[PDB]
Design a protein around this ligand. Structure first.
Ligand SMILES: C[C@@H](c1nc(-c2cnc(N)c(-n3nnc4ccccc43)n2)nn1C)N1CCOCC1
Length: 804
């Protein structure tokens, strides 16, 4: 009936936010209700014009390597109606000023050049300049903003010890309960139950007294119940609710099975009730409710100790001495923003009086608020080591600074950080909403990032579902319509990939694909859909005759689409790869880190010509990859040392284009060598590395006696020298420049890598430290890296062959 909006939202999300068949409290529903305000606040605040236009812009400097490209110091763009005309431009002009009511859209795309910013501060332009491409725009009338229409007693009075009664466990399918009280990844106190028998049901029926006072439990403390022989089952219960009240009564909680990890922190209970292990518990019964309420100077030698502590990397563990040092001199420690994580990892959270001091400490926010924004520092406070909302808010507040440009750089990482949140409604979840709804680009990518996790993760789908719904309710009639079209297409194509995969371990199946695709274009269809990994591009009908299946053991589709925009100045298709077997969420992260690195280099005016191709995880074990045109694997070129350069000349028609090719190869090869080493995904099989008919090398298939990174003799033959040329010198030089360019952001990468490991996949994270060579001077770094280069040369073709 009138509720003709909900089951729409539901099938977009892939989950239901009205469903209560798995909640044991109203936090999810409360957070649906709570999100209405910041939603309205952002919907109502956003300028309908610039929103419908979503101009993708930056405030960053136009880099030195791009400065060379600029004509005289003029720049040419062509306007179109059929008929066209060229215009000379100054790099500081405005769209409306160059215009001399009507708007400028980029040809073949849903992308606009509008608003009060210079043209040099447009992303498309900077792309066109980087690639050497021409800038093509059509005179068009601004899209109607009406299309975007938006539808419509104290706890510190309780001095008794905290107590939890374990009734017992049951499973329908040397075993004891392990009851921890946690704040972050920190264990406050820990009791246990007597080791009992192996029966599918065991009832201990004992009260357990914890050494912590009721008063001393901190907001966001977790009753973490574990089952050992040894660890096989875990479940968590926020001991304090979303209304600040201490929890009460009896609970039956179904538990996740094992086989450190962001899942282990989830307040979500297992929905599969008929198979999962459970537990019954009793919480201290009371009649009236319990709600939680709301210098001399330093000697030198100690300052030096403190300043060393502050200077260390994120992964350097703090001794108890360090912690005590940081604490006792908290007011001086406050003066340094870099001391914050280590300072808040120094507070005893299981102590009411201490937590207070911290809260009154955070009131003196003078210097933090004043400090220049540090994404690395900011990210540190959003990780699994911080479970206090006030600590987490001072981080979130710093993010507000970021221009949409930089949000899109950290979106995935930020979305994944929601997993470390203790409450469904948080400053960070809230921030993502705000930022998503204020900018269509972010909101498109938010949708997918969120939907990726919902379809694939039982530990966090409820949390992400309520946040997705929150976004959708303010994104507009326009985007709601597009998301539906996109959802339909992938919900069609994935089934097609599955059915096909089972029909093989040949040219028999290749005609079965085309036959199965034909009826999909006729019945159930959408003529056009937005490309999930590149929303500027609108795909049309399948180039049915161009589609195939691929020569891998995992069977991916090779698909070709027409462009639905008739104003596109090319006839070239849009390629996509549908794949089952490798988890694409791991690919997404790495590609995203790759973009971050490319932005890092930009700050040092370096370009390394990476190809971080589009890649969106869509559902369990399955998703899409962007097709890079004119590219081939290195292994196929081999089907040893001489052939690589010949292929390049074979594909390069002239000598300029061949010198442009080898120019391109050196940068891109250098780039991937640095990146892959830092990430520790260096040693890869030759079938997983590719190159374009133009020089650009690039890695693929990020699915997990070794070489630090793949630099081989055939690559070296193109560069010259037998196992130093004028090109091997450049390679060497730019690798050291690229390697040191990362080391200036040691902290940032450490935390991202650490975050990557916890949400995507201690001695595991420790690797990035060594790879970036922490604690060594710039000289030692150049040495360290060039030695790695030498290993690859000295080992030649060894490990390649080894893969039998
Ligand atoms: C089929 C043909 C080909 N593949 C591509 C191409 C393009 N873009 C990509 N992103 C891409 N990636 N990326 N991730 C992948 C994951 C798996 C497979 C492929 C992948 N592959 N282009 N071409 C012409 N290969 C020619 C060389 O011999 C092997 C077959």
């Amino acid at each position: 009936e009138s509720q003709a909006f909900q089951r729409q939202l539901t099938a977009l999300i892939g989950y239901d936010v009205t469903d209560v068949s798995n909640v044991h409290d109203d936090e999810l529903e409360f957070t649906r209700r709570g999100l209405v305000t910041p939603r309205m606040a952002e919907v109502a605040s956003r300028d309908p014009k610039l929103y419908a236009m979503h101009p993708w812009v930056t405030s960053k400097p136009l880099p030195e390597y791009l400065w060379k490209k600029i004509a005289n110091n003029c720049i040419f763009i062509v306007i179109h109606r059929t008929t066209s005309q060229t215009i000379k431009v100054s790099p500081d002009d405005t769209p409306g000023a160059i215009l001399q009511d009507f708007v400028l859209r980029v040809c073949g795309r849903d992308e606009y050049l509008v608003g009060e910013t210079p043209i040099k501060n447009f992303q498309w332009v900077r792309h066109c300049l980087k690639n050497g491409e021409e800038i093509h725009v059509v005179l068009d009338t601004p899209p109607d903003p009406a299309l975007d229409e938006v539808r419509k007693v104290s706890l510190w009075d309780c001095d008794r010890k905290f107590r939890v009664k374990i009734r017992g466990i049951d499973i329908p399918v040397t075993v004891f309960v392990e009851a921890n009280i946690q704040h972050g990844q920190q264990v406050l106190c820990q009791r246990r139950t007597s080791p009992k028998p192996f029966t599918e049901e065991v009832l201990w029926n004992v009260w357990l007294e914890f050494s912590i006072k009721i008063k001393d439990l901190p907001k966001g403390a977790l009753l973490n119940l574990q089952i050992y022989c040894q660890l096989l089952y875990y479940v968590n219960l926020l001991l304090i609710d979303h209304r600040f009240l201490l929890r009460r009564g009896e609970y039956v909680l179904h538990m996740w099975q094992i086989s450190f990890n962001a899942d282990k922190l989830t307040s979500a209970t297992n929905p599969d009730k008929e198979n999962s292990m459970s537990i019954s518990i009793l919480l201290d019964n009371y009649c009236h409710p319990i709600a939680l309420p709301k210098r001399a100077e330093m000697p030198n030698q100690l300052r030096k100790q403190l300043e060393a502590i502050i200077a260390t990397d994120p992964l350097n563990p703090l001794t108890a001495e360090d912690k005590e040092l940081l604490w006792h001199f908290r007011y001086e420690s406050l003066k340094h923003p870099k001391a914050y994580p280590k300072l808040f990892s120094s507070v005893k959270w299981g102590q009411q009086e201490i937590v207070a001091k911290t809260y009154q400490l955070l009131a003196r926010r003078e210097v933090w608020d004043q400090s220049a924004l540090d994404v690395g520092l900011t990210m540190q406070l959003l990780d699994c080591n911080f479970s206090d909302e006030n600590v987490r808010a001072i981080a979130v507040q710093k993010l507000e600074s970021l221009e949409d440009d930089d949000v899109l750089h950290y979106l995935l990482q930020l979305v994944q950080a929601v997993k470390f949140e203790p409450y469904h409604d948080s400053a960070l979840a809230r921030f993502l909403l705000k930022r998503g709804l204020r900018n269509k680009r972010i909101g498109h990518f938010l949708f997918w990032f969120l939907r990726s996790e919902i379809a694939q993760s039982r530990h966090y789908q409820q949390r992400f579902a309520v946040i997705l719904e929150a976004y959708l309710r303010g994104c507009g009639t326009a985007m709601l319509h597009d998301f539906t079209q996109q959802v339909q297409v992938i919900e069609m194509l994935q089934k097609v990939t599955l059915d096909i995969k089972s029909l093989s371990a040949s040219s028999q199946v290749i005609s079965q694909l085309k036959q199965k695709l034909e009826n999909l274009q006729n019945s159930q269809l959408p003529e056009s859909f937005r490309v999930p990994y590149d929303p500027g591009l609108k795909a049309g009908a399948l180039a049915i005759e161009k589609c195939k299946v691929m020569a891998s053991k995992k069977k991916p589709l090779w698909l070709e689409f027409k462009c639905a925009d008739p104003t596109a100045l090319s006839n070239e298709t849009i390629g996509i790869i549908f794949k089952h077997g490798d988890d694409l969420r791991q690919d997404m992260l790495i590609l995203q880190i790759l973009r971050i690195m490319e932005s890092i280099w930009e700050t040092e005016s370096l370009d390394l010509c990476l190809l971080p191709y589009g890649c969106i995880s869509t559902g369990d074990k399955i998703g899409m990859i962007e097709i890079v045109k004119d590219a081939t694997t290195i292994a196929k070129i081999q089907q040893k040392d001489e052939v690589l350069n010949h292929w390049l000349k074979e594909k390069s028609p002239t000598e300029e284009k061949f010198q442009a090719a080898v120019e391109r190869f050196v940068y891109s090869c250098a780039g991937y060598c640095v990146a892959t080493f830092v990430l520790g995904i260096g040693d890869r099989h030759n079938d997983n590395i590719m190159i374009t008919e133009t020089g650009n090398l690039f890695h693929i298939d990020f699915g997990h006696e070794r070489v630090p990174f793949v630099l081989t003799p055939d690559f070296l033959f193109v560069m010259g020298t037998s196992g130093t040329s004028p090109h091997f010198q450049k390679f060497q030089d730019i690798c050291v420049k690229a390697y040191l360019a990362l080391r200036h952001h040691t902290n940032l990468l450490i935390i991202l890598f650490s975050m990557m490991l916890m949400t995507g996949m201690k001695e595991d994270i420790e690797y990035i430290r060594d790879a970036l060579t922490v604690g060594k001077n710039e000289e030692d770094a150049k040495k360290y890296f060039l030695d790695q280069i030498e290993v690859c040369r000295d080992k030649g073709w060894t490990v390649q062959f080894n893969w039998f």
